[PDB]
């Protein structure tokens, strides 16, 4: 469809969703979803990130939840083609005042010891709050991603400085609804998602998603519409709260979130996002940035099934994700943390390569690429005769991901 | 802003809304909003259309409501610069199923609990003895159209039942979703072949009454196909031929047959709550976006209805969710938003109108007008009709010479509607001497109708200048523009002209 | 054709020119072309402007040439549908030094007395030279158009100030070839034509056009290519010199110029010219300028046969011509001078309405429009059922041409 | 500059050319330019291709010219960073008609005057007795293909005759355009069905000689249709299969059948002067623009030839008109410009090469590169061929990270040609070990070929790095870029790769 309007006119409620669900699903784990058996089913149904709410519970309790999450996750490790990484997120209590309380310091230190992937930092009002959280995590927690939660007016007013200091953003709509009038929160949500998309940083929408599923096996029309519109605004991930933490239908909530998010993909008009993001980006001569733009460009032309990115830290894959290709970004990494953290970005499908490093660099690249091809075929992103883009460095120890290759799927 | 993304990035919740609210507000009038004094305040606060729900009330009652609406409306007629036309809409009963009266004395509500049994009866002895065990309803054929396993929804989806056993004139059900059952509530039978007619005997009488009362539009309930629309058209007849028919899409068949319904109707109402019963929750937002899109493409008005500001029945302010849902209907492309119980029977009818106005006005800052137009221009079929070429040219000019308004001199409204299809940012000031045309124009996004009551000058060019000067005064007073801005003026050429084919670029003096 | 490249690829030398010749033809009148009988044939064959070279001849001699031009021109006046206005141009001797010599002053005064339409001012080096010519023409000659001839390096270096002071420009390629190297004159030509197009002022290419036709009935391949390329650069008019003044085939020269210019129209890609001219124009709220842009825009959409402009001074038609529509601009005027001067602009087909003024303004407009419709049908610009754009003012005595009308051809 | 118009407005005759000359220069070698010392100077001054005209001379003579060209070319081989490849082109005689020898002793020229009679004879007694009354020519069938009223042109259109009477073996004509008639001049019969074969007995021998001499390309004369091209291809055979065939379009039939000729050929030469005889003057500029356009769209080389700098046969500087005509051929999209008598037999062969270089270099300032590419990208068919996608991506990147060059490692040249089709601003440094590939690359606008003479490294990645480093040194020395600039590098992935499908963004060390 050559216009957004025609894209809307062609939507059909009777035809099933042909496209993959490209947004992350974050689920809050509590008494209802804590057991290894429930977590297994939640992972199969689409959970990408387990969130632990440190407003409640002891460290002993959370250590057991984390252990259960990992037991459930690694139960699928025996098939590396189908294995999905699952991230762990620590959501701080925060001030209920200083940015980091005595309790938050202890909780953050515990997160470092437990090897969590990301921190959702509560009640962030300004940049210096983010830097205080960074300082507590320290040298040992330096690769842990900090997602600043915008929960009040000051957070919204000072958004630009908070965004620049953070690794990502969580929009807490319910908390914003208390301090900001109802007729304005939807504008704040749209503003913040937009600015995050422009900056290439993850944005999560949270609170008041599928709350009615705490008691019911299906959500309301309004809730489906609200979740869908967060996806269409440009959210990278959607987070579920009590629905998965303590409700009666945690597994049904994950499945419904998956269905809604997958339906919303049919309303996304991908070409416009990219053309605007390409024009708004500053003119640069950084090799990686030029290669990322070129890859997304090629992914729209030679109607590509995927952009395969070989990445150690995830950074190269994130640079591609900023431009919002339609094609999935298969991020191949040997770093387990990188694979878990990648779920924060819309359209990144991380895969953890567990094979050992080959001495000949070109053979090692070919092995990781072949692994990505098998994963893509199995997930139905592409098949034999399709073409994909492959991004790598040139030589072992390259700082740039500056090599782009157009490759037919064998 | 040259990109949609930058348009979103520049949104600021602290800066007040610089732009006008361009969508229509339709309010349902009932016991809470019926009086001349309340209506006056609702009109000042932004009500453009009064909706009368003929599911309830006698013709005598509705005649008095209509009279009160007109008394309130004409109380502002002494200042023709500030006078706002107010339309009247008749919303038909249609093929409804309803429950009976709650039993006994005391509170007129009973708690139905999940897992509990409930017998549905058609025995008229129980018509006014509804309770936790027995529920009467008025659809006699219900046992022929429903099976074991069928779902039955009561009171706009509040309560749900599953049929466990059929009988001759009864059904034993189990309550799936509990709630308070009141008296005379609406019943939906999803996936059931309900044999009730499109226009009942009662609907015929109601439609004839609407013609006699000179209503501006009809909201036709439960439209399933084009022939239902044509039956409504036939009843309105020659005498009601200028009354606009808005088809309500309330079920799956309505959505499946949307194209034929749209082509037969003057416009569409999307009833989201009713659609939520028959269609899964994960799909209704797609149906809403599809239908609004197709209406925008066809140049026909689309109204979003149900589940707008329902919490304001009891509270002076809406929830964050409701604000977000209303706003998104506006951003999808809705021409109007309709309020139901919030204005009809709730405790804060005036606050509901004001909040709807605030939400809709805030949503305008998120609308990216240039994209809508560029796409609507490309999707329109290549034509040599003078009026269509002039309408496109006017909207084009309204984006270039950053225009404060497109002024359209129109008798029937049609010329102004053709401009509105292209979705200019600038307001369309539709100047007309026809009072009905001025009322009906509120159905279209971005049309600000003004009723010129001055007599016709013999020299045509002087008459045009007089109507344009009237539009200029109205625009200055509403803050659309001021001295030094430029406006587009569309007219015919000569008094007999069939086309609105003349465009004029005019500085505001 | 949606691209310039495809426009070139579709050119067909075997199909005849479907489009009108939109550039003006200026012919130098001398001993070979001076007679009433030859002028008649030159006018029928396409001459729009008669140029008189005041380097030679007495005032008596030139008065007779002017009289012969007018006798020939008015011989077609009995049919006002087919009558073509013919302009008279005085080309000064100039310095062969002050801008205006004693001789030039006398020649310019004679031009005012003879009611010439335009002056081609020789050897213009700077703006003050143009203002001296303006001062000599004075109040009585204030509507006479001054075309500055750029004949040397200083003229090119100071082009912007000369252009701003002049009504139009003549590029004298042969004279430029003496003072500027041959490998650079083509750049000067392209630069000057471009700047004139951007400013909305007429530009004429002169010298070394069809010189071989002084002795031969047909031009060379090279000369055809050179004339054609001046048209494709954006020239409004092409001027012939000795070919028509003193050569053996003056009538054949006019006809060949017409054929070359008409062939060149097939290579003009009109949509690009307009889209660029629209973007480069400064953002304004002048009603006439907005209406002119809108008219040209509409002329590309409702595939218009013409833009009809009712104009007293010509200015409204010139403002439309700046945007380079494909459709011919039929400029209807009662002012005989306006009709003659309009030939300086590419794409303007002037028509002189000789009917008396109707008292009712709307009827007078309708009469002039009907006249334009008959002229257009007769010239084959359009026929019954086509649609045209009509531009007018609103009341009698309107300063703006701010009214645009889409009109089917009856 | 964001518009073509502004690009023209900013042209400045006082500022020197900042950019390289990107079009090829082809020079005809004859008595004036034949010596090793002159060729050396012509190569330094910018000659990329030496053309040998086989209309005249023996094979012995041409073998010596070819040897001199190679001696001159290889004299610069001692510095492989600065060495420029020089191609050799064989231009066939084809089906030509020629006059005989001028009579008697004295001057070898006679004045034919307008209105005078001239008898054309086929009697071989008059073969060497041509004068004002009698002219012999070598086309025996001429009387069968010409009528009364037919025009006959002699010596590249200098003289024109009209046939007044036919005979068995004679034609009586009247001279229309007079001039000096010399010996053995070319004869054109416009609109006549000349039955001469596409490849004559002589052309077969000349083409076989070209294969033996290892020429790089053939300019095939008087190509009228695709089958003529295939006959030339067949004669070159298996041994001459990599020799490029450039079809010369010299008549109306060539233009009418252009598409099939283009599809059969490796490239095209537009012979404007020859076209000017058979096609009217007011149409040849359209044919030139059409043919260049179609060649650009197809990605095949197009050369403009004839009537370039002809006045430099006698003068050290060209005319304004000639400079303008050459410049406009470049701006139309020509890949190369060919010089004829200016370099073959004139008094200033070296000055002609230098002036051609200056004109072509000046014309680069008027080229608007971004438009060419954006249109060529849109007009190209949607494909999934890896090399084509990579070529487009490389040119795209060359406009963004303001690249100094696109470096392409290529064996046959094909990968570099695929990049050249998209018309990047940045030079395409085509690195090859194949000497023929390096010579043939000059046919394409914007390809700067470099011949790597270093031996192949066993490790593929090291070999790539070596060739890339060689290209970097060549680019630094030519001033295309310096340390800190960024370039695009295209290669295969692995030594067995069929595709050039790997693109690398590389800072210049
Ligand atoms: N990152 C999420 C969502 C996703 C799915 C498929 C492709 C891209 C993204 C996942 O791996 O499940
Ligand atoms: N038609 C509505 C909404 C509107 C307001 C302002 C401008 C345009 C439209 C009204 O008149 O109030
Ligand atoms: N102005 C010239 C050329 C022209 C012809 C036709 C249309 C537009 C322009 C004329 O009137 O003859
Ligand atoms: N191919 C020619 C012209 C050229 C020069 C520089 C860059 C590109 C092309 C050469 O190598 O000399
Ligand atoms: K928390
Ligand atoms: K109703
Ligand atoms: K002169
Ligand atoms: K030859």
Author numbering:
A (entry chain D), C (entry chain C): 23 to 118, 218 to 531
B (entry chain A), D (entry chain B): 23 to 531
Task: Quote what the paper states about this structure.
M1PYK is the constitutively active form of the enzyme and despite the high (96%) overall sequence identity, M2PYK has a low basal activity but is activated by the allosteric effector fructose 1,6-bisphosphate (FBP).
Phenylalanine and alanine were the most powerful inhibitors (nearly 100% inhibition) among all tested amino acids. The kinetic curves measured at the different inhibitor concentrations are consistent with phenylalanine, alanine and tryptophan each acting as allosteric uncompetitive inhibitors of M2PYK and show increasing concentrations of the PEP substrate failing to compete out the effect of these inhibitory amino acids. The carboxyl groups of the amino acids form strong hydrogen bonds to the side chains of Asn70 and Arg106, and the amino groups hydrogen-bond to the side chain of His464 and the main-chain oxygen on Ile469. They adopt a binding pose that is very similar to that observed in the activating serine structure except that the hydrophobic side chains of the three inhibitory amino acids cause a widening of the binding pocket and make contact with the carbonyl oxygen atom from Arg43, effectively pushing away the N-terminal strand.
